[PDB]
Amino acid sequence: SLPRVKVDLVKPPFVHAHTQKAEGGPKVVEFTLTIEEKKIVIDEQGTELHAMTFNGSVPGPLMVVHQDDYVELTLINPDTNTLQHNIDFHSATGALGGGALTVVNPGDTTVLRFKASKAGVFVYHCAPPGMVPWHVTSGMNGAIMVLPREGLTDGKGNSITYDKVYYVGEQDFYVPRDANGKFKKYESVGEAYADTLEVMRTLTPSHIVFNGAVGALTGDSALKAAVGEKVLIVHSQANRDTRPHLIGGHGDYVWATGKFRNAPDVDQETWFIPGGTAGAAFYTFEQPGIYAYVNHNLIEAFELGAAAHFAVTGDWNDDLMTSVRAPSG
Amino acid sequence: LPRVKVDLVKPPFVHAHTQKAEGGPKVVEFTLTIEEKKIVIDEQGTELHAMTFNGSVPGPLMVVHQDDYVELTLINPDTNTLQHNIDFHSATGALGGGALTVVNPGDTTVLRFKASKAGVFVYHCAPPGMVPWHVTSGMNGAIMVLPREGLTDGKGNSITYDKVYYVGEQDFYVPRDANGKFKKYESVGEAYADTLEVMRTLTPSHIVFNGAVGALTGDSALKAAVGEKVLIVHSQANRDTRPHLIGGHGDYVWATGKFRNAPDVDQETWFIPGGTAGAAFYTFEQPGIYAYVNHNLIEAFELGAAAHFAVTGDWNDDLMTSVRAPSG
Amino acid sequence: SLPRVKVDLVKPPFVHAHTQKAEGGPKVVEFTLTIEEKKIVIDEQGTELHAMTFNGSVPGPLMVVHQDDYVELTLINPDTNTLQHNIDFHSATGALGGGALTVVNPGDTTVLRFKASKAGVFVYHCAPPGMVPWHVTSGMNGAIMVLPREGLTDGKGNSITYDKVYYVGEQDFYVPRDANGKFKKYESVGEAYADTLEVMRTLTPSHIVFNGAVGALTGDSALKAAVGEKVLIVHSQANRDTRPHLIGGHGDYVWATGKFRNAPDVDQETWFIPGGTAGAAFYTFEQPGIYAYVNHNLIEAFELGAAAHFAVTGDWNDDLMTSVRAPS
Ligand SMILES: [Cu+2]
Ligand SMILES: [Cu+2]
Ligand SMILES: [Cu+2]
Ligand SMILES: [Cu+2]
Ligand SMILES: [Cu+2]
Ligand SMILES: [Cu+2]
């Protein structure tokens, strides 16, 4: 008897249409995710792997509701998938975040409803009994943002409004190599398992990437902004620690634990998001040009793939920075 | 000052205590007996020469109130082969006690320190030149120094737990032969050279709660009920961890473990760096099996950092309901 | 046309002459950094490394200004060096922290000016296109302290003053090793690249050191303090997580993210500084003797080299800690 609404999800790093401030009282918000197992290319050398996805993407798409809305998820495992799957929302209470009520085999479908009682950004991930880390570290994870009914505060009594929100999902991949050091291909997802478990046990990723590949958020695919634009960056990591840093920027407000009822940290150079968490950072760009957004373990960033770009339009501010004498003899 | 003697218990249970103090400061007396012994740590029967306080991994949780004094009798029997001591993160001076408590086999020592600062703190062995070997062999525990007036939400309002559990997370470094089988050794001394080589790689063979894979599952699950308020103390002497309660949250969390600081609320996952104790306070609102993990899920499901909760009571349809159950 | 000042920089762990409170309005503060490539010895076994340094030290020297002052840096790359270099300030806004405006080949010089518009400690590092991690993990990093114009405060409005500030740069090195396990040597810095890149890809450092070498801040080089002295410890790590602990001590006030407008954590046993960050801990010594300052992954500390000593003079306090019975 509550008013129902239907969300059309979009591929990251973009986010579906939503309001910051809620319009009316509680809604039931309907989402559908279709599980897809498939081969993807994750680097410039052509390295491929059998990814396990929600809605065809790594990471899974960002779901947005407000506090005390109800989420109603349709989860679909088409008969062309080979494996069992489910979904665990960190935003929900009971039955392993819904893991225990959503076990779906190839050909099956389920529907889960939970109250979003708590404001913040949370991880969702697959967690099928006896093969949890294999599904999560194959790209079967995403995030949900639950906004306060009255939108965001600076935790010091003042309302704040973003112009745009991007979702950056970070993925640790564990691809086996042969004697030479070349990455290996496998005919089916099943045949990759034993060799993949050997690599996971070393706790050393082969690749760490944003939006499912080395360079996925650079070139044509760089994140667009402008001087004076307020931008919110949601960052998730289902399995492993990371330390985001905007090169040439700061985090004006950062919820590192990702929970908006807590006052944010201010003036951040680098922030910390533990494995199993989603964080968020609010920034106002003050300087045009190319910016890098990285994991500031710089081997993880520049060797293993954990690096994106922003392209920012606008006028240079000489007061903030100026070259007095350019490099020369 | 008045004197009290405490009877310590095996983790994850905690000795009798009160949240609020009764009367003024006390000298609280504890005894720990060092015990070197063989323990099994996984279901393939892997063995390890553990080094323990009171014969458990981790050591027992000690409980006092702020500005009480701790008087510790540390006994190293003549059946142990090694030199030992204790360092308390709760104490001020002499490497936390380390430099006043060096006991060889057959020796006894008594340390007294004032518990000036409120919070949960790591205690561990730290013998000159052998520090990480003893600590990663299980020789560590924790101490909870409660505020005289019990716990608050950092907003003036007192909060009261029904039950407290201590979870000790241990990283172990067991050597292998050329086959990839774990090695056994006749004495503890013979394990050193090979153990120091695995530690150099910073990759544990096992990460466990309460001394072994499966230690806090099945019969040994942690018991709770819908409406019960529970405090979970979690310690790691050597390596970072990220606790998560699967199907739950942390309503009040002290990630750094020091109660004069205002807690974080509505937490999914929280962060305890190596060399720290933390505490999370939760009220259960749903029944069933919960998992409590280190949310590096490779560390949890493959290396052994996983516990279960069994929770009794009535299911709440408003919070979560299966609309259509899984089928074609 | 504000007033100009010139700074003379010192070798860490010491810090150049500064005031906690600003004397007057905004200034333009001039610093000079001369890049130097050279061989250094990082352990007691004479392991050598081709280091990449700002002003010939690892870390580089601590720069100190006040909020809303301007930093004017002259960066010199002499013709005796072989590589391209530059500088990125985490404290600056635009052009990759200054990295895109400061690219100096051997024989080149550049001058950069930025407003220090935000209070805190911040990392500075070399970041040349396609060579970033190699330069940073070769020791080409330091930090800058942008003090608030009114000096440091606790959270709750009250002013706090240190008698001494020390700077601890933590460096993760990745030195290649041949099958037997002996550390390799190279004729030039360019010959070490290919083999160093392979060690880096394992994310496993060969060494972790304070002030450029195992035991660089022990013995004659121990940090000096006295009972009653207030000490600020700035700690940076440009690449990798660390978890500092003062063994026998605490952090009375900690800014773990290193940004002073945020309220500090109190009564910390162990604090956490993520890779790419500077943090700061304020402590008043209560007890004399030898203290250890460590990264509390004790493998990283005692086996890999992340360990320093304080020498503290003064009177022992029996109240805080006493030996009732000595080991026998
Ligand atoms: Cu799955
Ligand atoms: Cu999870
Ligand atoms: Cu011991
Ligand atoms: Cu310690
Ligand atoms: Cu350089
Ligand atoms: Cu940087």
Interchain CB distance below 8 Å, C239 and A317: no
Residues of B in contact with A280 (CB under 8 A): none
User: Binding site membership of A for Cu cation: which residues?
Assistant: 85, 90, 125-126, 135, 140, 296
H/E stretch holding A40: strand A28-41
* Rounded (5°) CA angle B296-B302-B305: 60
Note whether B201 and B126 are same-domain residues. Answer: no
List the determination method: X-ray
- The two tokens of residue C124 are 């500075």
Cα-based angle B59, B64, B68 (whole degrees, multiple of 5): 130
Residues B192 and B109 in one domain: no
Looking at residue C213, its amino acid is A
Please state, as a whole number, how many other Cβ atoms lie within 10 Å of the Cβ of residue C222. 16
Tell me if chain A has a CB within 8 Å of the CB of B290.
yes
Instruction: Tell me, yes or no, whether B77 and B141 share the same domain.
Output: yes
C57, part of any domain: yes
Strands of the sheet containing B87-88, edge to edge, are B61-65, B140-146, B119-124, B87-88
A59, A142 contact by CB (below 8 A): yes
Residues A218 and A142 in one domain: no
Give the environment of ion ligand 5: residues with CB less than 5 A. Answer: C 52, 85, 126, 135, 140
Residue of C nearest to A325 (CA): C111
How many Å apart are CA C97 and CA C117, to the nearest integer? 13
Q: C326 in a domain, yes or no? A: no
Contact C269, B261 (CB under 8 A): no
How many CB atoms neighbour CB C47 within 10 A?
20
Catalytic residue among A37, A47, A66, A125: A125
Q: How far apart are CA B19 and CA B63, in angstroms?
A: 10
Dihedral pair phi/psi, residue A126, rounded to 5°: -65, 150
Distance between CA atoms of residues C78 and A219, nearest Å: 35
CA distances (Å), origin B192, targets A113, B82, B136, B206, C193: 54, 12, 12, 17, 34
Peptide bond into C13 cis (omega under 30): yes
Q: Which residue of B has its CA nearest to C155?
A: B261
List the structure tokens of A184.
Answer: 């290996």
C76: closest CA among C135, C118, C33, C37?
A: C33
Residue C306 lies in a domain: yes
Q: At which residue do the structure tokens 């069994």 appear?
A: B310
C55 and C9 part of one domain: yes
Give the H/E segment covering residue A198: helix A193-200
Residue recorded with tokens 């109130």: B65
**How far apart, in whole angstroms, are the C-alpha atoms of residue A50 and residue A117?**
36
How far apart are alpha carbons B150 and B245 in whole angstroms? Answer: 24
Contacts of C130 (CB under 8 A, 6+ apart): none
Q: Is residue B189 part of a domain?
A: yes
- CA C172 vs CA A203, A297, C123, C139, C239: distances in Å: 19, 11, 15, 8, 8
Structure tokens at A168: 């950056």
Nearest CA to C272 out of C243, C296, C308, C297 is that of C243
Using a CB–CB cutoff of 8 Å, tell me whether C203 touches chain A. Answer: yes
Residue C68, chain A, CB below 8 Å: the answer is no
Chain C residue with the nearest C-alpha to that of B195? C299
Q: Name the 3-class secondary structure at B3.
A: strand
Separation of CA B190 from chain center: 28
Task: State the Rg of chain B over Cα.
Answer: 20
Phi, psi of A6 (to 5 degrees): -125, 120
**Domain around C170:** 149-315
- Specify whether C90 is catalytic: yes
C120 plus C238 within the same structural domain: no
Rounded distance, CA C30 to CA C16, Å?
13
Query: Which tokens hold the place of C45?
Result: 């076994």
Residue ending a domain, among B122, B147, B172, is: B147
Residue in B139, B136, B256, B272 with CA at minimum distance from that of residue B207: B136
**Element housing A199 (H / E):** helix A193-200
Name every residue whose Cβ is closer than 8 Å to that of residue A54 and which is 6 or more positions away in sequence.
A33, A34, A35, A60, A61, A87, A124, A126, A140, A142
- The Å distance, Cα C132 to ligand 6 centre, comes to 9
Q: What is the dihedral of CA B11, B16, B18, B19, to 10 degrees?
A: 10
Structure tokens at C116: 């220090």
Question: Across the beta sheet with C120-125, what order do the strands follow?
Answer: C63-66, C141-147, C120-125, C88-89
One domain for residues A107 and A239:
no
Burial of B181 (0-12, 13-18, 19+ CB in 10 A): exposed
Concatenated DSSP letters of B71-125 = EEEEE--TT--S-B--EETTS-SGGGGGGG--B-TT-EEEEEEE--S-EEEEEE-
C residues 169-198 lying closer than 8 A (beta carbon) to A? 197
- 8 Å CB contact between C243 and C296: yes
Judge whether B327 lies within some domain. no
Cα-only R_g, chain A: 20
What are the backbone angles phi and psi of residue C19, rounded to the nearest 5°? -115, 145
Neighbour count for residue A254 (Cβ, 10 Å)? 26
End-to-end CA distance of chain A: 76
**CB contact set of B193 (below 8 Å; sequence gap of 6+):** none
Contact of B119 with chain C, judged by CB distance below 8 Å, is answered with: yes
Residue A321 lies in a domain: no
Task: Specify whether A168 is located in the same domain as A297.
Answer: yes
Residue A196, H or E segment = helix A193-200
Question: Resolution of this PDB entry, in A?
Answer: 2.5
CB burial of B190-224 (b: ≥16 within 10 Å; e: otherwise) equals ebeeebeebbeebebbbbbbbbbbbbbbeeebbeb
> Which chains have 3+ CB pairs within 8 A of C?
A, B
Element (H, E) at A299: helix A298-302
Alpha helices in chain C (DSSP H): 132-136, 193-200, 298-302
Of C148, C166, C183, the residue at which a domain comes to its end is C148
Pairing of strands A207-210, A141-147: unpaired
Per-position DSSP letters for A61-101, written without gaps between them: PPEEEETT-EEEEEEE--TT--S-B--EETTS-SGGGGGGG
Tokens of C108: 């080149």
**How far does the centroid of ligand 6 lie from the alpha carbon of residue A248, in Å?**
9
CB A16 within 8 A of CB A10: yes
Q: Does C100 touch chain A (CB under 8 A)?
A: yes
Q: Which of A165, A254, A249, A241 is nearest to A208 (CA)?
A: A241
Distance from the Cα of C216 to chain B's closest Cα (Å) equals 18
Q: Is C185 exposed, middle or buried (0-12, 13-18, 19+ CB in 10 A)?
A: middle
CA-based Rg of chain C, rounded to a whole angstrom? 20
End-to-end distance of chain B based on CA atoms, in angstroms?
Answer: 72
- Classify the phi-psi angles of C49: left when phi > 0, otherwise alpha if psi is within -120 to 50, otherwise beta: beta
Cα–Cα distance measured from residue C151 to residue C120, given in angstroms and rounded to the nearest whole number: 11
A191 inside domain: yes
Across the interface, of B203, B247, B321, the residue whose CB is closest to A203 is B203
Tokens of B21: 């103090």
A247:C202 CB<8 A: no
C185 and C121 share one domain: no
Same domain? A219 vs A278: yes
Token match 């800014």: residue?
A: C255
Ligand 5 centroid distance, CA of C127 (Å)? 7
Q: Establish whether C140 is a catalytic residue.
A: yes
Is B1 part of any domain? yes
Whether B96 and B162 share a structural domain:
no
C24 vs B: CB within 8 A = no
Residues A61 and A31: their CA atoms lie apart, in Å, by 11
Of the residues C148, C163, C187, which one is the last residue of a structural domain?
C148
What DSSP string describes B121-188? EEEE---TT-HHHHHTTT-EEEEEEE-TB-EE-SSS-EE--SEEEEEEEEEE---B-SSSPBP--SSS
In terms of C-beta density within 10 A (0-12 exposed, 13-18 middle, 19 or more buried), how is residue C4 classed?
exposed
Q: How many domains does chain C have?
A: 2
Q: What end-to-end distance do the CA atoms of chain C give, in Å?
A: 72
Domain shared by C163 and C85, yes or no: no
Give the pairing type, strands A28-41 and A70-76.
parallel
DSSP A3: P
Place of tokens 């059998």: A50
C279 contacts C235 by C-beta, under 8 angstroms:
yes
